Paper text:
Cyclin-dependent kinases 12 and 13 (CDK12/13) and their cognate cyclin co-activator protein, cyclin K, regulate transcription elongation and termination, co-transcriptional splicing, as well as RNA turnover. CDK12/13 control these processes in part through phosphorylating the heptamer repeat at Ser2, Ser5 and Thr4 within the carboxy-terminal domain (CTD) of the largest subunit of RNA polymerase II (Pol II). DDB1 functions as an adaptor protein for the CUL4A/B ligases and regulates biological processes such as nucleotide excision repair of DNA. The CDK12 inhibitor SR-4835 promotes the proteasomal degradation of cyclin K, contingent on the presence of CDK12 and the CUL4–RBX1–DDB1 E3 ligase complex.
To understand how SR-4835 facilitates the interaction between Cdk12/CycK and DDB1ΔB, crystallization trials were conducted and the X-ray crystal structure of the SR-4835 induced tripartite protein complex determined. The structure at 3.9 Å resolution revealed a linear assembly of DDB1ΔB with Cdk12/CycK in which SR-4835 establishes distinct contacts between the kinase and the adaptor protein, similar to the assembly induced by CR8.25,29 SR-4835 partially occupies the kinase active site and interacts extensively with the kinase hinge region as previously observed in the SR-4835·Cdk12/CycK structure. The benzimidazole moiety, which is surface exposed in the structure containing only the CDK/cyclin complex, forms direct contacts to residues within the β-propeller domain C (BPC) of DDB1 in the ternary complex, thereby facilitating the interaction between DDB1ΔB and Cdk12. The N- and C-terminal lobes of Cdk12 establish further extensive protein–protein interactions with DDB1, sharing an interface area of approximately 4,300 Å2, counting both molecules. These additional compatible interfaces are mainly formed in between the N-lobe of Cdk12 and residues within the DDB1 helix 2 of BPC, and the Cdk12 C-lobe and residues within DDB1's BPA and C-terminal loops. Additionally, the Cdk12 C-terminal extension helix that is visible up to residue 1047 in the electron density map, is displaced from the active site cleft, contrasting previously solved Cdk12/CycK structures. In the ternary complex structure, the C-terminal extension helix is located in a cleft formed in between the BPA and BPC domains of DDB1, engaging with residues proximal to the cleft. Additionally, the dichloro-benzimidazole moiety is positioned by flanking hydrogen bonds established by the side chains of Cdk12 residues Y815 and D819. In the ternary complex structure, this dichloro-benzimidazole unit forms distinct contacts with residues within DDB1, comprising a buried surface area (BSA) of approximately 180 Å2. The DDB1–Cdk12 interface is bridged by π–cation stacking interactions between the aromatic ring system of SR-4835 and key residue R928 of DDB1, similarly as observed in the CR8 containing ternary complex structure.
Numbering used by the authors:
A (entry chain B): 713 to 1047
B (entry chain C), C (entry chain F): 20 to 267
D (entry chain A): 1 to 394, 708 to 1140
The structure:
Amino acid sequence: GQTESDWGKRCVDKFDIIGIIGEGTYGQVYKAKDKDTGELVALKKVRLDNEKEGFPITAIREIKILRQLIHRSVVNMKEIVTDKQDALDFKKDKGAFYLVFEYMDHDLMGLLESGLVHFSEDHIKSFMKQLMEGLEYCHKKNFLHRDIKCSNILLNNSGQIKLADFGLARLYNSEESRPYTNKVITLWYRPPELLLGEERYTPAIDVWSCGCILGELFTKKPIFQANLELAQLELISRLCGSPCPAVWPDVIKLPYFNTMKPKKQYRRRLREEFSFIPSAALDLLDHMLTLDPSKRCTAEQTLQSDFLKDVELSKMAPPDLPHWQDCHELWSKKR
Amino acid sequence: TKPCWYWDKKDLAHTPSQLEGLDPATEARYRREGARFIFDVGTRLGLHYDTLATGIIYFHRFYMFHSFKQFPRYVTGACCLFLAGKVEETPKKCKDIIKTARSLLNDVQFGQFGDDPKEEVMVLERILLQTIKFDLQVEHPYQFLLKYAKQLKGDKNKIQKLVQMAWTFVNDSLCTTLSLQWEPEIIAVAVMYLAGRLCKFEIQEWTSKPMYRRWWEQFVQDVPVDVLEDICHQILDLYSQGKQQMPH
Amino acid sequence: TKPCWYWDKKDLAHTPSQLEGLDPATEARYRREGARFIFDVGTRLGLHYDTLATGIIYFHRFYMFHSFKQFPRYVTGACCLFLAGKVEETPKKCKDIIKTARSLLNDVQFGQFGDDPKEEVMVLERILLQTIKFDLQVEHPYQFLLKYAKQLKGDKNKIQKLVQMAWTFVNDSLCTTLSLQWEPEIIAVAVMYLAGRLCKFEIQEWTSKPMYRRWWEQFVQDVPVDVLEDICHQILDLYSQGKQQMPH
Amino acid sequence: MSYNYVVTAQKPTAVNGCVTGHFTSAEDLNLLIAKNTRLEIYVVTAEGLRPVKEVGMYGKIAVMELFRPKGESKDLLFILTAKYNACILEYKQSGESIDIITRAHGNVQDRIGRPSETGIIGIIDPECRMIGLRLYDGLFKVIPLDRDNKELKAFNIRLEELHVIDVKFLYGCQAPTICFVYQDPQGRHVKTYEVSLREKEFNKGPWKQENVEAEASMVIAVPEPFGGAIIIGQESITYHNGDKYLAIAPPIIKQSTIVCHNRVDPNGSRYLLGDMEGRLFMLLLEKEEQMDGTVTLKDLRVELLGETSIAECLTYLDNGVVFVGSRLGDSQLVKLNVDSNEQGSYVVAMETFTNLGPIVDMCVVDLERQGQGQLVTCSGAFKEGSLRIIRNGIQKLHIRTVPLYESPRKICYQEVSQCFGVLSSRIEVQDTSGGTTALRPSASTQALSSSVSSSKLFSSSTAPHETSFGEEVEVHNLLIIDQHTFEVLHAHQFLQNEYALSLVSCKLGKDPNTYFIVGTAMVYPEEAEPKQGRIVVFQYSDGKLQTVAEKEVKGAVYSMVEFNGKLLASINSTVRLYEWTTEKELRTECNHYNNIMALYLKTKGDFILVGDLMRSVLLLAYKPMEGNFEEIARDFNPNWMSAVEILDDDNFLGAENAFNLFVCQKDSAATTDEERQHLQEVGLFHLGEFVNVFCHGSLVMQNLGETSTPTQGSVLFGTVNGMIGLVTSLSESWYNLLLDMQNRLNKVIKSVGKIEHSFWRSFHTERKTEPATGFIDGDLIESFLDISRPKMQEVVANLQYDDGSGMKREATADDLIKVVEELTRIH
Ligand SMILES: Cn1cc(-n2cnc3c(NCc4nc5cc(Cl)c(Cl)cc5[nH]4)nc(N4CCOCC4)nc32)cn1
């Protein structure tokens, strides 16, 4: 059954490269169309030119982990292609490989930063249900995406959401295993345990990142916006409370607990400052943004929440994008 | 979806090595040489047992598509172990594997690496990834041998003697084409089946169905006794051929 | 096959005259002014009553497709009466109608006819025929008022007082858009309905079904009292605006 | 890096708000007109308005209300900016020295909050007890009017009703009471709450909630005599106060949406109203005094007064005069007579204030073929639509207005015919004849010659949509207008439901005839993205317009531009290059598809700048060897583009919907193909205006004599608020000099409300806030010639002037006066 299963034997000549669409985990992301089928695909470079250890191990992680994961809410690697190996001597071939993904219509980053899309409560339900179903699927397989960002959240015009990169993804083990990179998530979405120096962290790091995304869909603005780790920890304390042994018994274990102390010992004001959020969603946000990762809810528990338990995946409900009347805004409808 | 990595015993007479003039005994010898080479080298480097088998399975699959005469066996085996290290998250530097190879290979055998041993290995990685179709995830009968033994209840010392002896049979089965003939779950049952006969154990008694004379069925479904006897016959062929005796 | 010549009351707010800035009170006045203009001029010419209403029906339908600002009212009304004469076989020369119009119109109103009064009217005949889609045959509530009264039997003086009073209401309804809202059969029943309430006559007693209190149904089918009350309300609004009292 | 310089050539002309009170003195009656960044203070006289002071603020004026707290001699002014800068101001004049005092100042932005749909609302208690702010959904911010609250500290009261339409402080209540119309899934309703400064929470409202009109728009706080509130909608006017409920629904107000209101009588008996069609109404409140000595509301009445300009805000002055503040057309002073004139109108116009309004498109043309450029703009909308011819005078601007009475869209100049091409749209209503009837005569209807497209391209294939009576329809036309007389020589009416979107005038291929080319789109009630469109080529020759050729496309032709004899057109996400064959028909050569909505296009040589609805800007190069497009570089920072422009071969200028200008440039470093394709945003600047059209050129006299000018290049732009500005590039030497002066001028110049200049010009979206870079606020640099002489020397202290290559001489005040006066000559 070679066909479709045989990878690495196809050349990049079958794809015409349109251009760059954005920057991914390891390389820049490209757009292309297959000559035979006419399908738009997303490509990723391998760049095996560095003869230090040959094929990159971070790429080997993404090939092994993504080929095991199959879900409606995860971008699946379609195939892997290489450059033309024209010499008969496989020793002269220094060509790179390309990862072929499925192309989606838009990404949450481009949609929100431009300000065109608006999310109703039912749209957020469709977004979070697919997002947590995929995250629970990967968490059940003991994997950590470690880079939850709006740029790695892709959406098609039907209303289906999919996760993208997984280049920084590693395996999780209850046994300490390997100490990991303390900073791994974008500072605006970085968990409080990661700021304080936790090197062996739990899968709750992605739950915290998605929690910052849930509130960002209701406010149309990122929750915590800071340029430094101390300033980021301060903004988290102004909302969720300062990390203290009272609400976080193992906070003492973190190295930077005495080093990175907040300005004050703030009280939790999450429900107060998010009073405009429905109670069903506010209850979900409070659990996802819990300081202690052992007290923070899991991906499965979010699907058993009053906000997402009864959401049906048959109703895709795509986010409504304004159309035609947007061509000229601030007209007709004034006051 | 995923490629098929299993052939039949009769198909081994048509490997690219066989079709280039190599006799069946030589290819089987070249496979045991490459398997033990990957086994001994990774053992010297202190590698995990899953990393050793993953490279050995890459090695076995590679010479299903290519001939031993066109690709040096020890150069290929080093590349499989090097890739298996990055796959199973137990990496070693390419220079460390070459250094271990020179320790275990004589002047004649090490000549396969040419003037630049590192480059001959790094180059072969492209062809290895293409040949294995980038299907890097490989499972081994070890995890299934352990998954099935935990469900056994009885004499702890008798069960432990069963496991280690079967584990020895799994290490010996890597030198064979059994990795290509049958799935790893069936191999783990067959080594339990072989160690049970040698140790004179009634494995059915330790199961949740103490009467189920087909004790293997509660672990792996749809497995005839013909397959178990066939696998046991292949493993014991190594013991009678070589100088090692059956564990017993 | 045949065109539809009936709209709803709610549609009158979107006539071409209304959409050009004319307020509802002015267009209704322009219709009453034009209707009596067709009425008074043709009466001076000794025309049959069907000819007068035929031009008035052309007049009402014409300004459902055109605006009063773009077409002068009295020039259009003169053209309607001129065409209505040839339709109902009571023809008049265009010069004779212009002569009668100038006598009853002041210098300002007759100024709408321009330097050549005859040509400004004769030209409009092409646009009038196209606007009315060449639907020349027009029916009027007069023939139904008489056809229904002939089937009434009883006090000759009471029935004749009903006819003349209803006949007076038919002449007044030409000043309104009722001609466009409802068929002439409903108008002839409505004026019988109005004259019956004012004279306090129970018309059902004069019918072949003396206990059928909804006497009109044997004349015109599918007519609710809501329509009759709507027509009666509009007819009496003409009298209440001018403060004049019911003929009685 | 890139370095640029932006100056205001024409200040904002659109009136966003006006209030009446007693701000300058307790005796004077003041009319405070609010433009986008300018505040004009006038004094009402018997003959008209007398100006007294105009100040500029470092912020977009959002809320502007006059109030007089207990213990003040005259009214004070409260202003809240778009960037949430709040302040309370007082007028102080000691003879001829007029200064504006900042009594209180602060920023009332909350860390977390969803910006409301109906915008920022600001209300003040009738007793001047507090300032009410509606900044976010479900939050009511209260600024207590305390004497010591100089920082304008505030607390937020949670609001259950998230989507609020309008809110006012009610009159005649013992405790502070708010009345607001909110919209929930159960329709729109009116509700009341009592604000408690002591408890910092809402208490029970006076009167209960009522179900109101589905299109309830505005809330009117009826004063003490009547009490309660009035709710204005689309079809009905309703009065709510306690148990009393009155509702009038005149048929006149249903025809057009009512948008503004103002109180005439302080007792509240009469009110002014205005609709989108410019009509002016009078809302009469009939009072019936009862046998108990109390004056309940008998009935409500509306009377038509006349026609004014389409007003954003109305204010009644005195003696029957009303200031008509318009954003889409000219502002007015109107006289209200008790007797109607011969036309039935009670309104007579006194003065006309020129308002450039919405500048949809504009072109610089040397009419009197001299080096001094003139700017012809498409200005206004609906009946207020017009063309404006602006020229630099010999210092003010001379503006000629050519009223069109219909909405202009795009303009193009054709020197071969000594005329302009103007795309326009007018509103007609479905009449009883089945067709449509225009509301007013306009340029397309009063044209000398006229024509209608007889094309059968879309034929019957599209399903025939149902039309009901009373539905507005837009009719798009191409006007051929003389360049000297501005007479509508011809008007070509496009197909039904066909919108004119793009217009170019150029020669194509080997054809010597100069053509007008229009890109259109078929607009249907399903809207979404048009799936049909046409590209039409016209030739105006010897007074007659001839349809030369038509090309059917499968989308909307948002923009076209000619380069290399070929027509570059953007159709939805596609960017196409057409070739003009010898058969006078269009032929497709190559296409580009990697866009969302290719809106704005600019060319220079073979390069093409693509402005997408989002995606920011992309650089495309037509490769003549291969004959296909190829992406060169793209700006990957997402932006909602409003207008793009090419500065040079490596710098590009764009405008965002968040009133921000930015400049990206090729990095040209590290020799990486990925770094090269990354257009790096090197300039950021919050302009404060919504740019619609960028245009190369200058209205100043330009002599071919070559001299080192501090500015290089000239790009003009028009905005929605009528403001016209100029962008130009600088050398690295000049950038550091002018940037160093800005920091020196900020420490010297006192800003209205004590707003930091760096915060005002900082790049600002709802999601990101970045400091300004690569841009010199020229309006701040040109303010150096207006500060007193002691402040000039304060700026030049330790400042070294570099005119002398030899020695870096210490700068004199005159050395900087020479520099700034040179920058004032570029516009
Ligand atoms: C690792 N991995 C990636 C994918 N993947 C599949 N589909 C897309 C996709 N499609 C929407 C889309 N957004 C666009 C924005 C622009 Cl400006 C342009 Cl020109 C074209 C665009 N297309 N976008 C992106 N990224 C977004 C931004 O930065 C990094 C990657 N990743 C994608 C699959 N696996």
